[PDB]
Structure formats: C-alpha cells, structure tokens
Symmetry: C2
Subunit: 264 residues, 2 copies
C-alpha cells in the first residue's frame, strides 16, 4: 500500500547506516508516522502476499494472557519458537502485560478490560492506554516489547488507535504489525458498538536490513492493489471470545510473496 511504499523509499533515500545487535547493518530513520483510515479497507500489504493466519492466532493468544508457545503450536503457528525456552516459555511478554500487569502490592491489572470499560463509560477520556513496557519485568522477557504502547481515541462514533513502535523491520515486521493492530481495532469497535476510525502508526528506529535491498527494490516496482475488506462473521459475547473462524478477508488480490532471509 501507498503509505507503506512511501516509508520504504524514504528509508532508502535518507536512512543512515546503522548496525544492529552484533550483526547486520541497516538503513535507519528515527520517528515516523503513517495513518490508515480503516473505513477505506483493511490495511494488508498487496504488493507482496501476506498470510493472516499467524497474525490472527497470535492476537487471540495475546488476549488470553498466554505467554507460553503451546496454543500457537496446537495451531502449527511457529513465529515465536525462535524465542521460547525448552518449556515454550517466553517470559512476561505482551499477553502477560496486557491481561495481568503486576503491581508492587500484589495485584494484577487487566489493561484490556480496563480499556473496554473506558470506551463504554468514558469515551472522551485521554487516558485510554495499554502499555506492555513494564520496566520491572524487562529483564525476564525473551525480548523487550517492539510495539510497546498504544492509545485509543473516540470521536464522532469512531474508534481510532495510535501505536508506538520502538523498533521496526520495515520489510519483514511492519506489514504483519499493521494488520495485527488494525484487526484489534475492529474487534474493540464491534464490542463497543463503534465504527472503525484511523489506525495511526508511530515508529522509533524504523529500518531496512542491508541484506533486504534486492527484495525492497523488487517490491518498490509493484503497483499497490485495492485494499481488501475485513469481515467478522460473528459477534462474540466478549473480546476474549473470538475464534479463528470469525474472521474472513474479502477481495485480497496481492502480488506474489517475497522472501527475505535473516542473519543469525
């Protein structure tokens, strides 16, 4: 899609050479913002075919407060294997912070139920936020949260959401992360009887890996295709009741998928 393709070209055009953790060099820009009107269609990159099944499974896993790989495995979703230990444990990552933020005095905060309450009881609030950046549990996580902070906003019966992404692999990570949060806004909106608004993406260190140049140039050649339409075939009793089958993406005609390897 247009905004995505503009970002890629920008990193090429003005990114500085910056190496990552003992490895691959990257082209980096810092601070960037994109806006997707979810009313214009589901923001799934069309200039390269992307598979939604791992995204859906991972989101539903975040919502259950699950921090172990078991559920993803039952569904043959393997995107977190890289980080899990021999027990399939990832540490207090996303799921754990969203559903059970540990307090100094022994409580566990359900940030997403809190948010749902605010969206229904105080829609004009400027504090409808969920954070996965728990400073006290950072050392125990398999990896610090990439998408660390997100805020919801209601205006004219429309639910918007802004995500702060501290680090971003534009080619491999971003397409996957935009869809994941877009999908979450739709679920949130359906649950609160609100129309979908905007999904604003805000990133910090936004980069392209040096060994992805051929692929980015290949993708930059393609012309974006019309955005698909996301359809929820059911209306669960709560946000923790969604099933993989509930979602259907209609009208998705993408260019062929592109593969990008990684150093180790």
């Amino acid at each position: 899609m247009k905004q995505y393709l503009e970002l890629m070209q920008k990193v090429l055009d003005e990114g500085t050479q910056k190496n990552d953790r003992t490895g691959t060099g990257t082209l980096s820009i810092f601070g960037h913002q994109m806006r997707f009107n979810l009313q214009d269609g589901f923001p799934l990159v069309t200039t390269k075919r992307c598979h939604l099944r791992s995204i859906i499974h991972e989101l539903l896993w975040f919502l259950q407060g699950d921090t172990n790989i078991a559920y993803l495995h039952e569904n043959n979703v393997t995107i977190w294997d890289e980080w899990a230990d021999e027990n399939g444990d990832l540490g207090p990552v996303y799921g754990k912070q969203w559903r059970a933020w540990p307090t100094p005095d022994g409580r566990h905060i359900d940030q997403i139920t809190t948010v749902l309450n605010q969206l229904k009881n105080d829609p004009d609030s400027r504090r409808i936020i969920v954070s996965a950046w728990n400073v006290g549990e950072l050392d125990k996580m398999a990896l610090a949260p990439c998408h660390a902070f997100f805020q919801f906003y209601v205006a004219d019966g429309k639910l918007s959401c802004q995500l702060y992404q501290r680090s971003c692999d534009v080619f491999l990570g971003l397409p996957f992360n935009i869809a994941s949060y877009a999908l979450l806004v739709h679920m949130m909106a359906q649950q609160c009887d609100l129309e979908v608004g905007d999904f604003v993406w805000t990133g910090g260190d936004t980069h392209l890996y040096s060994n992805h140049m051929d692929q980015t140039h290949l993708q930059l050649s393609r012309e974006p295709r019309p955005l698909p339409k996301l359809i929820i075939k059911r209306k669960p009793e709560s946000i923790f009741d969604y099933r993989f089958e509930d979602f259907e993406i209609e009208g998705y005609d993408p260019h062929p998928g592109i593969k990008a390897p990684v150093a180790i």
Copy 2:
C-alpha cells in the same frame, strides 16, 4: 515557530468538537508528529513570549526524583500547586517513575541512569527508553502522565529523542513541553559527549480549548522570529548536578506574551 503554527491552524481546520472532563469543549485531532532539528536553534515559541525559569526548575525537580512541591516553592515556582495536597505531595508522578520505578519484588529502577549507561555503552540500542506510565501506580498519582513515554536514538554522533504525549493543550501546554524536552536532550548529549540531533514530538489527543480561540487567532497573525540559542555555561559531573544558573538562552526576541484563562 513554523511547525507549532502549522499545528494550531490544523486543529482549527480539521479538529472535531470534543469536551473534556466535565467541562470546556475543545477542537481535537488525534495523532500528530513534528520534528525540530536542535542544531537549528532552541525550539522556544517566539510568536508569544514564554518564560523558561519555571521549565528549568521543574526539569531539575524531575531529575532529583522529587515528587513534593517544596523545591519548586523555595524557588517560587508554582505550576504544580494546583495538584499538590496540603503536604505538597503529588503522588508517584514523573520524578518518582524516572528515578525510582517500583518493581513487584521490591527494587526501584533508575531509568535515567540506565539510559545514560546505554547511551555510553550501547549507542545503537533500540531500547533506550524511559516511561512514566506505571500502570500500578496510576491511581495514586495526582494526575496520569501527559508526556508518558520517550525514546533516545544515536546516529552519526547525534542524539535524537522522540516523546509520546497522550494529551496536549496546544496553546497553553505544548510550548512549555517542547522546550522542557529539548533542554533535556542538550543535557543528555553534553553528558555523553554527543551532538544534539532531532526532537520528535508525537501527540495523541492534541487539542485547543474553545475559550482560547481569540488568542490562537491573535498568535496565528504573528510571523515567527529566529530561534534563540541555548548555552550551558558549565559541564556538571553528572546529569543530576545541573543548576538553574548553568543555562542561558541567547538571541530570544519574542512577540508579546498572550494569556489564556481556564475554566474551573
């Protein structure tokens, strides 16, 4: 300044009518990003005279982990009186989270010393972040943090910083908040032997109060003047050693200050 004036006009041009906590209506836009190259001069609004002394005093107060009004009072700085209790206590706000984030197991995390370590030992890190959004202490704070999350970034010997502001009063709050963080980048940079880079401002609910329309129109009439130059007359032994006298702003020729009242 230009970016600031563009924001004001934008809120006027496309902001929706949105009321705040049991009160004044506002014009609101959600998600906005501005960039200031600190090498081009200190970002202090010139189209309306602003006073830096309360800013400096407040920043130095944040750095000391102080959460009580006493220090500001000794200096006749009264911007936090509104929130303090009869004891001058504000609760675990900014200062407390920056210098002593409480963990579930009894530790207190010095986020700013952590950051300083990372800037000197691992400058290419994508995790150089300080968060004041401690979910477990939110109920105890006089008010939830407005400027809740900020990330540092190093590239080409230049220190950049991105701030996420959940809520923003464009006329009254923003000018004060841009200068405060710009000043902090300079101190951080000086301490780490780095040049200043960019200060990226990212906001969520960015608004203008309805009863500020005359003032915004007055300010929107003025032509921005050259940005002043920030000079630190000393190089303290640590970031916790700065004194009010250390800072001097040179070449500041602003238009007359404008006052904006508030409902109660």
